[PDB]
């Protein structure tokens with residue numbers, strides 16, 4: 001249950017059209033909004049942090065628990081322009097944590113290639129307007145149901161078994177190439193799942209050992225609001241009115257994460273954010289949202 | 295060239311309705327309207343039409359609401375038309391939208407209030423639709439203003455109007471009734487809620503085609519849960535098997551009159567327009583339920599009718615939410631037996647435990663580390679055991 005921040009670097013327009021900078025990074029846990037708000041996090045990355053730093057200072061430590069039998073949940077919180085996709089997918093020179101995770105996992109596979117009778121596989125889909133579509137193969141809406149042991153199985157979701165680092169990025173690219181176009185749409189969420197089946201050296205080759213699962217989620221642009229002029233929307237509003245004020249930071253995503261918001265989970269959310277005053281309003285709310293999470 | 299103006303306009307109008315399919319060129323049409331405006335500047339009606347044009351320009355000025363200049367046009371239009379048809383409240387409502395983007399809820403609210411008042415001061419199809427749309431917009435506002443009560447009122451009004459016209463779809467009505475009854479639960483006005491789901495139940499006579507029935511059943515259960523809470527106003531733990539130790543008056547004429555005074559409004563809420571109010575009368579047989587005492591058999595029966603509907607949901611769900619719903623139902627039936635405060639009747643208490651035994655197997659199924667889920671189910675067994683603790 002951790003919350004971290006990635007403050008992005010300023011762009012040409014921001015430097016040309018000198019916008020006053022609002023976000024000030026102070027240290028690992030502290031940054032100041034404008035308001036002069038000393039927001040406190042579990043880790044804050046500044047405008048120049050590398051992909052390796054982001055991975056090594058987050059996911060790498062997290063993987064220590066993953067390998068120990070924990071399930072993980074990753075929430076790339078942010079708005080359009082946050083750098084969320086670059087952070088996860090990344091560029092060739094600066095590939096994101098998804099790539100790095102898999103490459104690191106190849107290392108982890110090597111670490112237990114002798115030790116354990118393990119196997120791995122991966123899956124990946126898009127959530128768009130609460131609709132679920134497999135991005136590893138062209139499919140329709142997937143059926144999220146519980147399996148023979150109550151696991152939240154996204155029925156119809158494929159499961160792949162790559163070996164090389166080329167496949168890692170190649171397939172990550174292929175998957176992101178299948179995402180809905182707005183440039184990737186601001187309303188698209190990416191959901192990956194890492195399946196770690198493993199069996200301890202001293203345990204029987206047919207010994208029942210739980211599978212560790214890591215969910216990687218690229219959240220859609222976070223950017224109380226006027227509702228759409230529709231009867232269905234009115235019904236939804238009625239439902240909202242009927243609902244008790246949970247007041248939690250908090251969909252099909254929660255269905256997907258039903259058992260991944262529970263115990264034995266390593267949940268982490270990152271707020272990739274903009275430093276410019278142009279986005280001041282959203283930034284304030286984002287940082288306060290992060291406080292809701294904390 | 296007014297005829298040619300409206301001619302072009304109407305073409306543009308159709309086009310305004312039309313890989314972007316709008317905005318790109320819609321804006322061009324916007325400007326074409328301004329060109330059509332040009333010629334205009336009797337004349338009193340011209341000015342009305344001017345407001346209409348500028349209104350149309352405001353309407354055109356959207357582009358994902360980027361074109362704030364429309365706001366300026368609309369304000370002028372208002373002034374032009376305040377001297378004195380219904381499209382003008384549409385405009386006011388549109389200004390409200392703009393304020394919602396600017397977060398100016400109060401002014402938007404004021405517009406909506408006057409939109410309503412005006413029509414009422416006044417006293418064949420557009421309005422019929424628009425009017426209800428307005429009520430919805432108010433509900434949106436009320437959400438933001440937490441005017442839940444007022445919103446609910448409007449909700450009923452829209453339900454009415456949907457019923458007045460052919461805005462029908464059973465699933466929608468189901469969830470409408472569902473949330474409405476929940477509202478009433480939230481506001482403890484159970485007595486009004488009574489006809490709501492049950493009215494929807496009537497509607498169901500004309501996928502979720504069958505699967506929605508569990509949602510419906512859940513709500514029927516909710517009735518009972520709160521009806522049992524009504525019974526628990528004289529908390530069973532605090533009283534014996536007897537009741538009306540409190541005032542009796544369960545159907546006191548006094549209360550009937552009180553309820554009738556309230557029913558001056560609730561009967562208005564009964565939107566069965568005679569025909570379906572007669573259907574509602576068949577429903578009223580169920581609505582008659584208020585605060586029953588020696589009716590645990592009937593109470594259970596009320597459950598059983600919808601229990602069987604519930605059992606279809608046990609079928610529809612793949613052994614997961616089956617138990618989430620069973621969980622509730624077991625307690626529900628057991629609570630009827632809490633009300634059936636007799637040492638001679640504990641067989642049902644056993645039967646509810648038997649269902650929990652059926653719900654035991656799922657705890658070996660759930661291999662996910664759902665400790666608290668599992669514990670909750672263990673608590674359900676504790677509860678069953680508590681039935682017996684009370685018997686012993």
Ligand SMILES: Nc1ncnc2c1ncn2[C@@H]1O[C@H](COP(=O)(O)OP(=O)(O)O)[C@@H](O)[C@H]1O
Pocket residue numbers: 006007008009079080081082083084085086087184272273
């Ligand atoms: N958090 C960031 N870190 C580094 N560079 C960033 C960051 N945010 C924005 N930039 C860069 O500028 C562009 C804006 O990020 P962007 O891709 O728009 O986020 P997204 O596309 O998911 O909305 C990207 O190419 C990104 O690499």
Ligand SMILES: [Mg+2]
Pocket residue numbers: 084085086184
């Ligand atoms: Mg992206």
